[PDB]
Amino acid sequence: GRVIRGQRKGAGSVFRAHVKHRKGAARLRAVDFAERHGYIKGIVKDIIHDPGRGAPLAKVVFRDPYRFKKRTELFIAAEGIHTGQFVYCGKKAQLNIGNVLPVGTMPEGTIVCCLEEKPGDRGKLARASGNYATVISHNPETKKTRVKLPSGSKKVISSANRAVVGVVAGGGRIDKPILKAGRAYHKYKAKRNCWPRVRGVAMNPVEHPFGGGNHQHIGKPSTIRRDAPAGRKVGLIAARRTGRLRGT
Amino acid sequence: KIRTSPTFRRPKTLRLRRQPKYPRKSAPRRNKLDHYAIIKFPLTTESAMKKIEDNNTLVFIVDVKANKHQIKQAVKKLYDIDVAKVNTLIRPDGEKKAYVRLAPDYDALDVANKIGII
Amino acid sequence: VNPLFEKRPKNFGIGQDIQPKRDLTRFVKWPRYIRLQRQRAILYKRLKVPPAINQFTQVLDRQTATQLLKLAHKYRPETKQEKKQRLLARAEKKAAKRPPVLRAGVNTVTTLVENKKAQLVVIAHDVDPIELVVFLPALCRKMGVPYCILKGKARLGRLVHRKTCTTVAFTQVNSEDKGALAKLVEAIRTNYNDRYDEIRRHWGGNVLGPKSVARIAKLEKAKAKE
Amino acid sequence: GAYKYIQELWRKKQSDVMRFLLRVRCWQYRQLSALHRAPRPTRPDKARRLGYKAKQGYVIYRIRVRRG
Amino acid sequence: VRPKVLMRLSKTKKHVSRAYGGSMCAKCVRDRIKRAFLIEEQKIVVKVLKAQAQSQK
RNA sequence: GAGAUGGGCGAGCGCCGUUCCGAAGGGACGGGCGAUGGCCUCCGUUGCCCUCAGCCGAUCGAAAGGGAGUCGGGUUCAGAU
RNA sequence: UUUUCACUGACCCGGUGAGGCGGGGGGGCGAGCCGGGCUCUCGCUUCUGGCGCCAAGCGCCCGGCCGGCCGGGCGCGACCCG
Ligand SMILES: [Mg+2]
Ligand SMILES: [Mg+2]
Ligand SMILES: [Mg+2]
Ligand SMILES: [Mg+2]
Ligand SMILES: [Mg+2]
Ligand SMILES: [Mg+2]
Ligand SMILES: [Mg+2]
Structure with a gap:
């Protein structure tokens, strides 16, 4: 296959923070x-x-x-x-x-x-x-x-x-809902290139461990173990539990 | 002595001056850019004639390594005239043309007559 | 006195007035070579130095060292210019005995010691590989010749006309110096040769830092109180 | 000759004396850089038996190689 | 004027005849003077009261 | 943003690194010392001592960014702030 | 042989222009004890959008001209050992 984007993020070619206008x-x-x-x-x-x-x-x-x-x-x-x-x-x-x-x-x-x-x-x-x-x-x-x-x-x-x-x-600050992709875009433009997140299921199998199929389905358990190699460690990373919380 | 700053800087030591036991080169090189080798020939086109008649200038073609100071000194040496100002440009051919204007009490027609262009 | 003249005291409290330029030599960022050559001494204090090396710390006292140097001054090896003068003199006398002298050098001294021709041995204490002379005291004791440790290979090499010498030995002396040499030999033998058992079993180093011992003292004093 | 004694010392690398020496020297050379000139050979007997002489034109460089 | 034009100008045209002239407004100048005087006066008051309390104790 | 020295790594060509494991200043208000020229007046060029002193790191990086200072008339066949 | 606890000196992390660290002396405040000593504490800045460096002062030396005039050095101020 090919190197996934979460795995590409490590080199920091186009994923480095935008820090010119920061004040220190x-x-x-x-x-x-x-x-x-x-x-x-x-x-x-x-x-x-x-x-x-x-x-x-x-x-x-x-x-x-x-x-x-x-x-x-x-x-x-x-x-x-x-x-x-x-x-x-x-x-x-x-x-x-x-x-x-x-x-x-x-x-x-x-x-x-x-x-x-x-x-x-x-x-x-x-x-x-x-x-x-x-x-x-x-x-x-x-x-x-x-x-x-x-x-x-x-x-x-x-x-x-x-x-x-x-x-x-x-x-x-979190109280006010971002109403539009424009506000979200302006938010993340001052931080880094990470905003328009593309789902794995929408990708191709060469591109993501979830991509492919005639239906958009993950096709395998979403909980991956902690000791999984980079390029496979996607989804819910070593989840102790999943689902909607009921109580504390 | 006590220290007042918490940094240590390299102390300044005695730097002795070069005295060569023998010169690296046998003799000083000869100045190959002299007055004769700095000026090649004067232009003799219709534009040059119009300039020498009207603006009291002299048009020369010099080499690419000459500057205005050297051109002025070379003209003064070779032709025994006073020079007001020098314009220079590099032609599309590669030669460097020079426009040399003379002091108002010299006559460019007479200078051209004596140099040999007319 | 002029009434204008009046003291203007400076109050160096916290955050009140700018501190004066006092001595900062204890907090200077020293270069790496100074830092290394000090930390090496600190580790030599820290680690348990084996007796084979610790024996060089216990050194001859100043008065005996001065007497040894003043006696050895009479036997310094001749200089190059003195040898040239002797060569000219002998050529002149031929065209017209070997006095006793210090034997310098570790190889010469060790072969004299193992052949029993040395009446005492002087050893430096700071040879920068200590292993050049670490064997020597045991050899000298076994052969019987007296040996001493003298502070400073530099001063030891001043006797010869060289920058530094590790060890020198007396092979023979003169009638006017027999008694002084014998007294010096007996003092050195009492101090060094006869104490070799506890010298050989005397470990070194193994001492903590001042702050460490201070806090240990505070702890033990508190414990003794209650 | 002292050189033979030094030879047996350096053959007995396992004793406490040589353990102390190797510990201290290794710490010092570790503090130093990876390529520097030693003013004197640390083992004169070994350098001499390898071909060194106390003349002008002989130099000793002490250098460090990452292990493994 | 532009920063490099101020080389040509003269000091009289560059500043005003007062303390901190041409660098701080007159309002804040007089406020600074009053603040300094009043802080010094209260420092004197505090020193004398502290010394009197120390003498009493 | 690119890129040397120190440093580290590397079989090696070399690479990482840009202030991080460096003794990273060759400057100066001024005083003294010793020599020199100018009517050795007073000053200047001076070598040493005394004293004072942080750079964010050499260097490269914009003919649209920052960046003092030219305008009017005339003139050629083709050039005009 | 191993388990725990403890130390620091290899090794590692952070900050700084590597600027006051550990002891002892000295001084203030109480407390308890008969002007004295022991344990403990602290040492100078909190009404205000101001200023703060390049030592005042003291003591001891020496230099120059004629006790008077000019110009230097050292220590304390800014405790001592590591
Ligand atoms: Mg994007
Ligand atoms: Mg698709
Ligand atoms: Mg796959
Ligand atoms: Mg004004
Ligand atoms: Mg590079
Ligand atoms: Mg530009
Ligand atoms: Mg521009």
């Missing part, structure tokens, strides 16, 4: 002495919308504590932050919306966005529009804390990693 990578502040021990404050200057990402971004200006300069950083904007606000980053910054401080100091039940998965990583978790994470419990020994991720999984992280306080701005 949204990252937390780097770890240093000032925020490790005390705190520093930065001014919020602009709140920008970058292409391809639902959540807006904030441009925060800090001053270098080691030389005469001003360091500009791009954050994930939390709800309620306004331009000209003061945001404080550090170990002993008070707990209120906007500020970033380690999860080991906030009381349990705190709502957290742009969580940092490992110390120093500068923010990896709960950074999509309207998402957040919640501190569950602390372990004073071994320096670990338990958090609940937006997918519902509970994960244990080191308490020495920073995290923004609040919930990511731009919630409820």
Whole structure:
């Protein structure tokens, strides 16, 4: 047969992301002495919308504590932050919306966005529009804390990693239905070439393991095992269960 | 000495200057683009005659490696005249024509008479 | 004093005023060769060095080393210009004894040791393959000749007129130096030759880092308290 | 001669002394690059018996080959 | 004018005679002056109150 | 978007890679030191020391993108900002 | 021989212009104990869309001209060992 499109996606010839008009990578502040021990404050200057990402971004200006300069950083904007606000980053910054401080100091039940998965990583978790994470419990020994991720999984992280306080701005974006293929086209044009999805059953057998036949039917179980070679691993990938959910 | 920056840069060392124990080449090459070899012959067409009579210019055909400064100096050397400005173009044949206008107190008719074109 | 003159103190609190240019030599990103030549020493501290190599760390003390060098200064091999002068002098005398001298070189020293013609042996401690001389102390002990470890193959090679020498040996000395040599030999034999059992069974290395030992100390102190 | 002693040392690669030496040297050469010039042969006896001499015009290059 | 035309122009035509002249509007200039003065005054107040509390304790 | 050096891989021609495992700056406000020319005045060309100093990575990539500055009249057989 | 627990030094991951890491001293705040000592804590920035670098000051040396005038160096400020 022939190489299927899901298998062609790996080389990234025409499937690479469109990143010319993006405004930068949204990252937390780097770890240093000032925020490790005390705190520093930065001014919020602009709140920008970058292409391809639902959540807006904030441009925060800090001053270098080691030389005469001003360091500009791009954050994930939390709800309620306004331009000209003061945001404080550090170990002993008070707990209120906007500020970033380690999860080991906030009381349990705190709502957290742009969580940092490992110390120093500068923010990896709960950074999509309207998402957040919640501190569950602390372990004073071994320096670990338990958090609940937006997918519902509970994960244990080191308490020495920073995290923004609040919930990511731009919630409820999925509420509005795309009414037309035009809106869908404009949505995915700013992300990558993946939108007009063509069904496998509509294809030819040389092109897909489902294509062919005088009737449009899959012809074989849709659940494929996890250890199937690329070019065969299509359908429902190693499904524990299938069908309509009934209950939890 | 104490360090104030957390980076290490390569220290600047003494770079001694070339002194060759023998010249690479035996003798300096001869300038093959001199005044005689830079100008080939003057055009003697009706357009050239009209130009020399009207615009007080002299029309020459030079080689492709000559620039306006060299052309001006070569004309000054060969014909003992002053040059105002030079226009140049490369003909479709491959030769590079030159339009040489003279200072207002020289006469292009007299220069053409002495050079030998008329 | 002018009342205008007045101190303007600088407050280097967190996030208040720009930090001064203090010493940063402990946090510099050193080049790869420096990093390698320091981490090699760190690993030499870390790993359990076998006694065959650890024996070179226990070295002669400074006063005895100075006496050994000042005694050996009387027997440095002659220079090339001195040999040229001797050649001219001998030609002049012919047309008109071999004094004792240090024997340098690992092969010369080892053959003298196994033939029993060396009254003591001096060994360097930092030969960059240690295996050039790692066998030597056992050989010298078995043959009976005294041997010592001297800090610095460079200073050892200063005695000869060469950049570096691994080992040198005294084959014979003079009447005015017999007593000094004998005293030095007996001191060296007491320190090195007679201690060879615990030298041979003395393992090295196996020491942790300062932060590691500090936290272990904190843990054990807490345990001893409760 | 010390060369024979060095020969039997390098024949007894399995002892603890040589295990320490090979461990340390392998770590160091691994930190170094894959093609560099050694100022001196690491095994003078072996290089000499292979044909090396301490003259001018002889050089030693220590290089690394990916295994398998 | 275009950015490379400003080479030809003179400083008087390029700026205005004031602090931050030709770089910041007069409204924000005066707001900045007032902000600076008031922040310094409240810093003095906070310092004196803190020192008085420390002396009392 | 293409593409060297470092690095890695490769039997090999070579390939990956574009800041990633590099000691990646040959510059300068200024001071001193030593030599030189110009009425050695004062300055300039200077070699060294003292001091100051980040580049997002060499380089290529648009005759429709960015990019200071020419217009009027006349003139040929065929050229005109 | 194996199971678990523990360590770090090979090996791996992340951040930085590799900028304050681990100990000890020093200082403040209480608490408990008789001006003294022990355990514990902290060390300077949270009303405001402002500014912040290229050391003030102190102590000790030396240079030049005539105690007066001009111009340099070192340490503290910015604790010590790893
Ligand atoms: Mg498409
Ligand atoms: Mg079909
Ligand atoms: Mg098939
Ligand atoms: Mg104006
Ligand atoms: Mg390439
Ligand atoms: Mg163009
Ligand atoms: Mg254009």
